[PDB]
Amino acid sequence: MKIEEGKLVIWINGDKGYNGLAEVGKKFEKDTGIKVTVEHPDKLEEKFPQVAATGDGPDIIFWAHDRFGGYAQSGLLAEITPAAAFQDKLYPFTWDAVRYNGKLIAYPIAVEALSLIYNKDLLPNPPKTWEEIPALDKELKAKGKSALMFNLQEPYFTWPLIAADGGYAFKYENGKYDIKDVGVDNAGAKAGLTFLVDLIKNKHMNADTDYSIAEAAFNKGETAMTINGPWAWSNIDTSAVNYGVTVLPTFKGQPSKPFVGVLSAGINAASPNKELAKEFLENYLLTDEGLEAVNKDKPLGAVALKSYEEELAKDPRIAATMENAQKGEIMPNIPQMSAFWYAVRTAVINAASGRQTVDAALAAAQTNAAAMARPVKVAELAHHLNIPIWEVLLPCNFCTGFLTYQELLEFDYKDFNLLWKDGFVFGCCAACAYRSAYHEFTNYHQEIVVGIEIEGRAAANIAEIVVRCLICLKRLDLLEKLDICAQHREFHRVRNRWKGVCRHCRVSAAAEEWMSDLDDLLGSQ
Ligand SMILES: OC[C@H]1O[C@H](O[C@H]2[C@H](O)[C@@H](O)[C@@H](O[C@H]3[C@H](O)[C@@H](O)[C@@H](O[C@H]4[C@H](O)[C@@H](O)[C@@H](O)O[C@@H]4CO)O[C@@H]3CO)O[C@@H]2CO)[C@H](O)[C@@H](O)[C@@H]1O
Ligand SMILES: [Zn+2]
Ligand SMILES: [Zn+2]
């Protein structure tokens, strides 16, 4: 479905000040007459790339900067072009986190970092090292309480300990990041995760402790310490708990390295209100009047606005937030970060629950992260290899030839997908492309429809149906499909896929693997 013009729909995570932002949306409504609707769906960071690719989705997407690069690579975000004076209104390093391929793709909002939150009534002077926490918990068990309870279901909360001794996501030496080099199955990461598992072995922590269980246990004085961010400061105030925000403990003397997140706001590429959403994000809801209103509901930490960050720089809770931030490192915004987080989430959960040893869980995370971040397009492959496209030597999957430079560019032009077999990567040459389309169309042809009849047969609008050229396999754009409708021409259903003629073209066991390889070549979308 298409987005309604004249209305702003904003998606933001549930643990943020969405009520504090909805009140700012009404201030923009009093001056412009445009209602600003906020929504906090579950798994919005995953549902957004599902619906933004079909033109649907909200107008503004709120998340930490690590996810936006994947949205920009998929062509889901609109380029942010602020004024030269507006870029100096915010800190320069916050803009570096929202730049992808030399282009601003989001608005920096606030810098987030984990910190050690403890109950001062139940723990004076928290420990400076993780190693003395088992001894500290044994004393509090006699008092009927526990020492530390934080979220163990999201790797964001456990990564400070894992990265303290050598664990890293993607290694960056001199230029960019190294996708093939992931630092999850190293000696330092195995040490950090082992200490976390032994904490669960000795009944000092519970593997099923999530976000709300660790929050309720700290908002009721049941546990002494809890690791969380600035957004969870308001729930502790309403619970009347004398707490403190201090530095995270160290492991092997080395300080914990939390992954620093810059909350950002991106504009949907299919939004009919790009200028309306830009006016809200820039002038009439980002200044000190807007950031202060959102901070009332859920605190944001060290904001990116200079005129407002100095008014809270002397905050003891925010001062420690920046101390853990400098001892950590900023999250990459590369599209491969989703593969990293998915692999580490499984590793921590499987290790904590005892389903895998720490060694096996981290070894599999290394393999899974690389296997999920592997290039799908020729351009991505050349960038992965840090070589120009014409230096790529890509075997064809369907014959013994290697692709020419033109065939390499045509591979991505026709929206093909790289094939991975036995470690080798494969493409498809021009002759095999046309040869596969002919065999597919002359052996698996199912039905014919005339123009707009495809919408009923496919149960989808013409814009949302994936149609490829029955001759050259290229993906048809919206105008090619509408032209077939206007000219009353034929759409064909072949191998449960829809085919047509692009504006440019005119006219047993070995075959099953052939047609199976063609499925992976064309993909689902
Ligand atoms: O089991 C599948 C799970 O998938 C969903 O969560 C995923 C996300 O899709 C990924 O984006 C990633 O999440 C990262 C996140 O990208 C990163 O910003 C950071 O998130 C912080 C955030 O910065 C901070 O502002 C605050 O909101 O806390 C967040 C962490 O709780 O770290 C995340 C990694 O933990 O990886 C997770 C999966 O690990 C989906 O939301 C899950 O429900 C689902 O189970
Ligand atoms: Zn070939
Ligand atoms: Zn064609």
Curated annotation (Swiss-Prot):
One cellular component term from this protein's GO annotations in UniProt: ATP-binding cassette (ABC) transporter complex
Tagged with keyword Transport: yes
Record's keyword annotation contains Signal: yes
Induction: Induced by maltose and the transcriptional regulator MalT. Permanently repressed by cold shock in a PNPase-dependent fashion.
Protein name in UniProt: Maltose/maltodextrin-binding periplasmic protein
Compartments where located: Periplasm
Protein family (similarity comment): Belongs to the bacterial solute-binding protein 1 family.
Protein task: Part of the ABC transporter complex MalEFGK involved in maltose/maltodextrin import. Binds maltose and higher maltodextrins such as maltotriose.
GO molecular function, one term: maltose binding
Name of the gene this protein is made from: malE
Subunit structure as annotated in this protein's UniProt entry: The complex is composed of two ATP-binding proteins (MalK), two transmembrane proteins (MalG and MalF) and a solute-binding protein (MalE).
GO BP of this protein: carbohydrate transport; cell chemotaxis; detection of maltose stimulus; DNA damage response; maltodextrin transmembrane transport; maltose transport
